[PDB]
């Protein structure tokens, strides 16, 4: 499956807060906090050299990782950006995002990429028209979705749609905490995506 | 429909009219001519005609008519493999003991009826050969009446049944003095005397595929008696011991010699569904039937006979060789393949990767498997799995278990000799007022081998006794044979030379001939004494001339002395693996090279 | 015979058909004397059929015989309204 | 192990019988003809040329002569009637062969 296991263990692994578990691996405890260093039996072992490889692979890697979606598929879309004119670096970055699942989280609805994907498969999705559960299903030229029917009612629905009702999203994500509904605009673009990384690093890494 | 099935078996033995019973009755069963034997049954049944039973169906009337079935063993032996017929008590509702009016019954038959004596199934006496002259029929009836008077039946008594039969199809019967003909009363002496095995007029399918086989197309054959439900998958099924199972295909009953998938099964009869589950695999132990609801079904029931012939690989020098299967791999494939059909066979794993403890039933039983191995193309030695001297400081701590074999005080002095001569300590000879008398001789696995053979030659079949162990000993201090008249071994590979085998020829007997070119370790006759030697010759030397002539001399030489197997195997004692082949049978010592033998002996101390 | 019949295009459980012409010899899918309109009975597209009326006719001209279901499809099309 | 179709065969029997028979026919008579022309019996040679022409086509009818079968047949025929009958002898009943 889409990986599983002690992941704030990864919090430690890569560093750049893999708080990513969603909340506390996000506040006072998870490499992002606590022994911030690379975990392991030798995590506190003064590192060594970074093969230009260590480099590219590293970036490519945590990158893919923090999104909970197949390495294969990943590379796939990549290609797409590659075989679909336009700095594939960008195009892809975008594609990365535009994924349903990706979005499931992206819009506060979800608090972690994982719970996000989860819900996605589990229903409570409001595709433009009733719904879809493919924590994959891209997000066509910015569409609408949200706490589907019989969903606007689950305790966690609450936790979320509820504690939520506040903050704003990005320049490509339309947050309507109202009738719990999110709507996409257009290709997110470099800038509007915090999440530090680069691109080149990773694509070259691929080059063959 | 199940209240008309009548499946019975026609016990037998060393003689005299196997089937005979099953066959001939055709009248009845068949078109016209010819053959009418075989009969029936089976494949390579020339020299003899045992093993490979099944089944005796045919919708033959008589008329009478029907009963029905007419669908039971039907099984001789001369068993080989000791029991086998066991799969008969798991269906048959009566036995057809076919004795001879010339001498009566044979010890060989003193089992087929015994193993089921504690029944259960009123045997059906059948005196044959009465068509001849010398063969009192009234006297035989009296003798066959004491077979129970001392063992009970109890309702036998009857034991009536009580037939004589006749060559020209009498058969009597009934009994005396010409039946008809004889193809109109025998039927009555069965039906009217045969009941309808308690079958479940309804419920699920309870067919216990006792036996089982396979065909180069007709897949695997079920083979067994239906206990409940029947019968047209699929409609999966269920197996015993394990799940059993997915589903099923068809089912070829026993209409006489097929093959033909029973249009509709139910019970009583001895149907054998197929197709489901592809005959994968087969174990006359489970109890196929409906989908659970619910296990289980009996019985096992019994197969553990005795005997043991260690197996190995002809890792000798002569190459290479028999056909294409001499290594271990090829052999193994055969071993397991036998642990399927065989019911009286017990394959065991020893120490030597090239050794096996083939535990069969009778001394001859193991032969059937060996004889069939050659014709298939696979040379192997016999037995020959020895024991281990432990444990361990030490001197052979094996076990010791003896058992009398009545007796009939006509062997009390013929059996006490061997045992007493082989250390066979008679821990106790439980006697009785009847006439026989048990004799438990704590014998070890070292003094038990081959014993089964000679034993059957002492009491003449009428003598059974097994063992096991009482406590690991140390072998004592004496050798348990070790056989008399040392075995003549060779001194190298080459060929038999008249001038070589001529010299030392009066020093006993010879095996091979000429130019017979054997090798080292291979035996070529027995010594006039107990000592062993390793002569040689080819050479036969020497040629030639001139000069000159003309006289004289022209030594000849006698030939085997050859055989049997069967007549050479039991000849061993220490380590003379009877290397057999799909067209030949040799016998060499565990150590070919002479000087090599001394390495292991090496005696004290 | 020279006929206008269809072929199946799609996959597993999906069969649109090629409204085409060929000689009743080349497998329902064999090459085809020529392509002419397409149609799908499961529906989906609002555009579940395009049976070129003209070609229908022209071809039709000399002997063009059509599957029966063919003929009905084309007439429907409106290549068969004798007005 | 049974299949009606054999019919075919049997027919071949019938048909083939016939057709040959005829083919023979035209062959042989055409020949005979060729001969008359040869000897010089112009007149009769022609008559033949006739019965000929006739049967050739009769063949035409079915599957014995075909396409241009009968064609060459005739062409050959008449050209010959003439050539043969060209030892100075007059196209007597020059019917079958026009002016």
């Amino acid at each position: 499956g889409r990986y599983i296991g002690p992941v704030c263990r990864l919090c430690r692994r890569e560093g750049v807060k893999l708080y990513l578990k969603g909340e506390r691996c996000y506040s006072p405890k998870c490499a992002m906090e606590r022994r911030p260093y690379p975990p392991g039996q030798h995590g506190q072992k003064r590192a060594r050299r970074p093969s230009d490889y260590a480099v590219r692979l590293r970036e490519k890697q945590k990158l893919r990782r923090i999104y909970g979606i197949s390495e294969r598929q990943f590379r796939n879309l990549f290609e797409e950006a590659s075989k679909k004119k336009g700095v594939t670096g960008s195009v892809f970055l975008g594609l990365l995002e535009s994924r349903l699942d990706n979005v499931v989280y992206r819009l506060g609805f979800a608090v972690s990429r994982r719970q996000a994907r989860q819900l996605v498969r589990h229903g409570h999705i409001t595709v433009n028209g009733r719904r879809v559960d493919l924590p994959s299903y891209r997000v066509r030229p910015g569409d609408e979705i949200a706490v589907a029917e019989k969903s606007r009612n689950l305790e966690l629905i609450r936790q979320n749609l509820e504690a939520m009702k506040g903050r704003k999203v990005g320049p490509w994500l339309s947050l309507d905490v109202e009738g719990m509904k999110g709507k996409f605009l257009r290709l997110p673009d470099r800038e509007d995506l915090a999440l530090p990384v680069n691109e080149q690093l990773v694509i070259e890494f691929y080059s063959r | 429909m199940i209240e008309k099935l009548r499946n019975i078996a026609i016990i037998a033995h060393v003689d005299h009219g196997k089937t005979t019973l099953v066959d001939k009755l055709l009248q009845q069963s068949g078109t016209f001519d010819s053959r009418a034997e075989t009969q029936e049954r089976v494949m390579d049944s020339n020299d003899l005609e045992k093993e490979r039973g099944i089944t005796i169906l045919a919708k033959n009337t008589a008329a009478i008519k029907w009963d029905y079935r007419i669908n039971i063993v039907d099984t001789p032996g001369h068993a080989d493999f000791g029991g086998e017929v066991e799969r008969v008590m798991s269906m048959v509702d009566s036995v057809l003991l076919v004795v001879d009016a010339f001498d009566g019954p044979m010890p060989q038959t003193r089992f087929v009826t015994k193993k089921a004596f504690a029944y259960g199934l009123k045997p059906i006496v059948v005196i044959n050969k009465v068509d001849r002259p010398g063969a009192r029929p009234d006297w035989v009836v009296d003798q066959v009446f004491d077979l129970f008077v001392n063992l009970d039946a109890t309702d036998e008594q009857l034991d009536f049944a009580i037939v004589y039969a006749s060559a020209l199809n009498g058969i009597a019967g009934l009994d005396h003095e010409d039946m008809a003909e004889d193809m109109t009363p025998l039927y009555q002496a069965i039906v009217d005397h045969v009941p309808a095995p308690d079958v479940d007029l309804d419920g699920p399918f309870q067919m216990q595929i006792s036996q089982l086989d396979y065909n180069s197309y007709v897949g695997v054959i079920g083979i067994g008696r239906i206990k409940r439900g029947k019968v047209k998958p699929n409609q999966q099924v269920t197996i015993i011991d394990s799940e059993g199972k997915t589903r099923n295909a068809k089912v070829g009953k026993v209409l006489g010699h097929l093959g033909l998938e029973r249009i509709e099964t139910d019970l009583a009869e001895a149907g054998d569904i197929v197709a489901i589950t592809g005959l994968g695999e087969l174990n006359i132990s489970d109890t196929v039937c409906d989908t659970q609801n619910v296990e289980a079904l009996p019985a096992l029931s019994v197969d553990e006979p005795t005997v043991s012939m260690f197996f190995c690989v002809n890792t000798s020098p002569f190459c290479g060789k028999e056909g294409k299967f001499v290594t271990s791999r090829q052999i193994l494939d055969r071993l397991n393949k036998e642990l399927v059909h065989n019911v009286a066979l017990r394959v065991e794993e020893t120490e030597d990767a090239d050794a096996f403890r083939v535990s069969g039933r009778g001394e001859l039983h193991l032969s059937v498997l060996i004889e069939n191995m050659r014709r298939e193309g696979f040379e192997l030695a016999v037995s020959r799995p020895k024991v281990i001297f432990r444990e361990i400081d030490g001197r052979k701590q094996e076990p010791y278990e003896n058992v009398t074999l009545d007796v009939e005080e006509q062997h009390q002095g013929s059996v006490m000799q061997a045992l007493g001569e082989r250390k066979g300590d008679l821990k106790n000879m439980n006697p009785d007022g009847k006439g026989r008398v048990r004799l438990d001789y704590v014998i070890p696995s070292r003094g038990l081998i081959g014993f089964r053979s000679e034993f059957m030659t002492m009491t003449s079949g009428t003598g059974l006794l097994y063992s096991t162990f009482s406590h690991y000993d140390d072998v004592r201090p004496g050798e348990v044979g070790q056989r008399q008249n040392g075995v003549l071994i060779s001194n190298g590979q080459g060929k038999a030379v008249a001038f070589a085998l001529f010299g030392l020829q009066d020093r006993g007997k010879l095996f091979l001939g000429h130019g017979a070119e054997v090798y080292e370790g291979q035996i070529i006759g027995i010594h006039s004494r107990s000592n062993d030697l390793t002569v040689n010759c080819l050479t036969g030397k020497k040629l030639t001339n001139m000069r000159a002539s003309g006289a004289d001399e022209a030594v000849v030489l006698v030939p085997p002395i050859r055989m049997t197997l069967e007549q050479a195997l039991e000849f061993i004692d220490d380590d003379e693996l009877v290397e057999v082949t799909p067209t030949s049978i040799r016998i060499r010592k565990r150590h070919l090279t002479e000087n090599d033998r001394r390495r292991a002996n090496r005696a004290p101390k | 015979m020279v006929k206008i019949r269809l072929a199946r295009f799609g996959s597993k459980h999906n069969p649109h058909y090629r409204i085409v012409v060929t000689d009743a010899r080349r497998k329902r899918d064999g090459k085809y004397i020529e392509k002419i309109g397409y149609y799908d009975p499961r529906k989906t597209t609002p555009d579940w059929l395009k049976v070129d009326v003209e070609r229908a006719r022209y071809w039709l001209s000399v002997g063009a015989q059509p599957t029966d279901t063919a003929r009905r499809l084309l007439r429907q099309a409106g290549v068969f309204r004798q007005e | 192990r049974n299949l009606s179709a054999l019919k075919r065969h049997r027919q071949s029997l019938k048909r083939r019988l016939r057709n040959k028979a005829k083919k023979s026919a035209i062959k042989t008579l055409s020949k005979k003809a060729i001969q008359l022309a040869q000897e010089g019996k112009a007149e009769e040679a022609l008559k033949i040329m006739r019965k000929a022409e006739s049967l050739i086509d009769k063949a035409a009818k079915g599957s014995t002569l075909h396409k241009n079968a009968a064609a060459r047949r005739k062409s050959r025929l008449m050209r010959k009637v003439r050539q043969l009958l060209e030892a100075a002898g007059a196209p007597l009943i020059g019917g079958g062969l026009s002016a």
């Binding site: - | 002809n314 890792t315 001499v326 290594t327 791999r329 090829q330 052999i331 193994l332 090239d354 | - | -």
Partner: protein
Amino acid sequence: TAYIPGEGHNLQEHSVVLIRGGRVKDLPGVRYHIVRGVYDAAGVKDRKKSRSKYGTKKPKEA
């Protein structure tokens, strides 16, 4: 000739098994080799890590 890998073994003349082939420098002519479990030849008993090659299913850690 080919290499008999796998720590422990057996197989006498009359022993099948097989070669997945594999040169094995340090002993010329070993242009191929066997593969534990092939028909006859069993597997590296009492083994633990890396086992597909030197074939041996995983142990129920019991």
